[PDB]
């Protein structure tokens, strides 16, 4: 029945990414002093069944000027590498056990931006043309900030797999010891996935609407359901790579219970920001990475290398 363990995953998650869109504007509602979608629910909890159905009724135009062969294979992705990445992710028991799999995320973190470059180019001119070009450029310069500061800690835990990374955070919430890094693990995923303070990719201010501009109701649910299938995953990751829970070979169930009451707090962070801060004006946006974020990330790497060796600490792995 291994095929019914899968399809029990893909389906029950599409409800979260659906019902996030509701808690989008309730939480961001009371920052403003008001209430959130209310009239339709009664509580509102019934809103997203009505919204999923307005789009696919609503007619899906294509530009007369487009290349239809690319205008499909691209979105036929924004929903794969979002739903594949979930596969080897322990909670506690991952569906797959990949030996070195931690590295496998970067494989699928790196291969999504090659679905932006298609779509914005697939269609047409300068609002999605050079406007989907220069959100490529920022999306690849926030990896080098990443793979390093992912690679740092992994000196402090011994291997590339995720079954060890529950063992080492036992009674030490891995955020003490590298708290300088942890910050930069946060501003990255918020800068890379195109969210609030570095917002530019999806346009509001700097342009009209980035990269979404052409898709009518028909395809544009996918992206608007793809872009929220990354955001609740990196944030359902960070908390396996920092704030660890305590496995329990007996009541596995109490592992996940206490696990979603963390990863679900953590997420409610990209909403708790977006009410707050303004945007960066694309110069300042990269111009603050090389100069500023990076020099440290190298420097710390020269540090977490020696700290095990200089304490006879060297973590028990191959």
């Amino acid at each position: 029945m291994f095929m019914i363990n899968i399809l029990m995953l893909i389906i029950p998650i599409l409800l979260a990414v659906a019902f996030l869109t509701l808690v989008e504007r309730k939480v961001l509602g009371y920052m403003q002093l008001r209430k959130g979608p209310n009239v339709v629910g009664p509580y509102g909890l019934l809103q997203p069944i009505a919204d999923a159905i307005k789009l696919f009724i609503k007619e899906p135009l294509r530009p007369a000027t487009s290349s239809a062969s690319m205008f499909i294979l691209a979105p036929i992705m924004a929903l794969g590498l979002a739903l594949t990445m979930w596969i080897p992710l322990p909670m506690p028991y991952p569906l797959i056990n990949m030996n070195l799999g931690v590295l496998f995320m970067l494989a699928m973190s790196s291969l999504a931006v090659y679905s932006i470059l298609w779509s914005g180019w697939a269609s047409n001119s300068k609002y999605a043309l050079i406007g989907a070009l220069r959100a490529v450029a920022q999306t690849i310069s926030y990896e080098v900030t990443l793979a390093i500061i992912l690679l740092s800690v992994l000196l402090m835990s011994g291997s590339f797999t995720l079954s060890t990374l529950i063992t080492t955070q036992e009674q030490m919430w891995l955020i003490l010891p590298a708290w300088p890094l942890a910050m930069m693990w946060f501003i990255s995923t918020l800068a890379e996935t195109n969210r609030a303070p570095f917002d530019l990719t999806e346009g509001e201010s700097e342009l009209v609407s980035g990269f979404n501009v052409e898709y009518a109701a028909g395809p544009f649910a996918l992206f608007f359901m793809a872009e929220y299938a990354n955001i609740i995953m990196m944030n359902i990751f960070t908390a396996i790579l920092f704030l660890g829970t305590s496995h329990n070979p007996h009541m596995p169930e109490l592992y996940t219970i206490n696990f979603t009451i963390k990863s679900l707090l953590l997420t409610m962070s990209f909403l708790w920001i977006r009410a707050s801060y303004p945007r960066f004006r694309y110069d300042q946006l990269m111009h603050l990475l090389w100069k500023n974020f990076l020099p440290l990330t190298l420097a710390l790497c020269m540090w977490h290398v020696s700290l095990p060796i200089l304490t006879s600490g060297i973590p028990p792995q191959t």
Binding site: I6, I10, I72, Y127, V144, A221, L222
Partner: protein
């Protein structure tokens, strides 16, 4: 043998869902006029995409810092050895060979 069962499962929901959205009302009987009114709010736009350089280097500039952090990758497996000094003395070279390669270019980024 069950990985590919967990991949082609995933696409086939996605490669399905394009047609049941894009295609299904696409053959609907509504008007859908062929008028060249599309390509919103930059009506005509006749040009080649000109070369704009400081767009370009931020490609190259990365690609090279990229390589060696593949070279740099097998530290945590190499922390288990016999003679370890040839590591710390050597490991710390790559980094400084990376960080140097900054400082030079750092005289000119331009507007990045």
């Amino acid at each position: 043998m069950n990985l590919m069962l967990a991949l082609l499962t995933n696409f086939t929901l996605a490669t399905l869902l394009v047609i049941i959205a894009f295609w299904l009302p696409q053959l609907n009987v509504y008007s859908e006029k062929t008028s060249p009114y599309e390509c919103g709010f930059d009506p005509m736009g006749s040009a080649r995409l000109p070369f704009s350089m400081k767009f370009f280097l931020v490609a190259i500039t990365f690609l090279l810092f990229d390589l060696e952090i593949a070279l740099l990758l097998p530290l945590p497996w190499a922390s288990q050895t016999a003679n370890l000094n040839t590591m710390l003395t050597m490991a710390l070279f790559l980094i400084i060979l990376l960080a140097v390669s900054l400082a030079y270019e750092w005289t000119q980024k331009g507007l990045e």
